[PDB]
Ligand binder design. Structure first.
Ligand SMILES: CC(C)C[C@H](CNC(=O)c1ccc(N)cc1)Cc1ccc2c(c1C(=O)O)OCO2
Ligand SMILES: CC(C)C[C@H](CNC(=O)c1ccc(N)cc1)Cc1ccc2c(c1C(=O)O)OCO2
Ligand SMILES: [Cl-]
Ligand SMILES: [Cl-]
Lengths: 149, 149
């Protein structure tokens, strides 16, 4: 549970937003990329895994599941690469809802940033700090700390 | 001290490596940039603060302390922007040692990556996972979790 992440790819302004969600907490990391490639996904995973203890990643689609560069990054970082098939059907809708929520935040900050990448990081900030009462940022830290102890 | 970070800028292969160190744990985040500008530093801080609870940042030099874009990012993210003057003289050497250690790791992985940015993220991974016995990654999580409770 504490090491499980899900990849998610959404689109805005003719650009691609790559998202990793910590399943147990709802905490996210995200980046804007020109297009979703194996190489971009692999690089994003290397960054993620140096920052949080990533044990398992549910990939967002079959191309990233298949990508040799993604497989190389998962091997390098000690990550079990799995599919992201929603065997639990509620999973699709939950990801859908997050994407809409993220796009909504982006719209609310879009004025304060010249570049989309900046607005996305602002949206990450707002999402992770939002009290729902703990925040996603508080939850991920508590979950991982409990796992260590 | 759970919210205190220090910025650090080092050079390699004609490029700039921008580093943020969580002072209490030794945990780091880093990025390769073309050159250290206010705008790059501001963007890096927005990313950092969406991921960890950044309360205070000791800036790496006077230009980033002065930068209006850096000041804007600190205001936006709720960060107290401070100087990084080593009133404790041991601070200079500790940062020095980390930079040398980081460059050494980069050299050990440099073969496994075509691009410096990739080697830097690999070095971040190795640094944060290294058992010294807990790792920096374990320490930052424990420090922050304890602060929340
Ligand atoms: C902290 C934030 C409130 C302001 C920063 C500076 N932006 C402006 O002054 C500005 C300019 C024109 C506008 N129509 C709106 C805002 C944002 C920022 C920081 C670092 C970056 C950026 C950006 C960005 O604007 O995308 O781009 C990559 O490096
Ligand atoms: C996971 C790692 C073991 C291998 C990845 C693929 N690299 C190679 O196959 C390769 C090619 C030529 C060499 N002389 C050495 C390694 C690294 C990687 C992943 C994502 C990226 C990258 C890189 C990068 O190589 O910098 O660049 C930006 O997006
Ligand atoms: Cl870690
Ligand atoms: Cl946070």
């Amino acid at each position: 549970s504490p090491g499980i992440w899900q990849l998610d790819c959404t689109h805005l302004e003719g650009k691609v937003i790559l998202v990793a969600v910590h399943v147990a907490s709802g905490y996210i990391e995200a980046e804007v990329i020109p297009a979703e490639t194996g190489q971009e996904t692999a690089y994003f995973l290397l960054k993620l895994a140096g920052r949080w203890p990533v044990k398992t990643v549910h990939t967002d689609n079959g191309s990233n599941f298949t990508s040799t560069t993604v497989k190389a990054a998962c091997w390098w970082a000690g990550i079990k690469q799995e599919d992201g098939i929603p065997y639990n059907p509620q999973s699709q809708g939950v990801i859908e809802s997050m994407n809409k929520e993220l796009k909504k935040i982006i719209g609310q900050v879009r004025d304060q940033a010249e570049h989309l990448k900046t607005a996305v990081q602002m949206a990450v900030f707002i999402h992770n700090h939002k009290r729902k009462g703990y925040s996603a940022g508080e939850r991920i830290v508590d979950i991982i700390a409990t796992d260590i102890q």
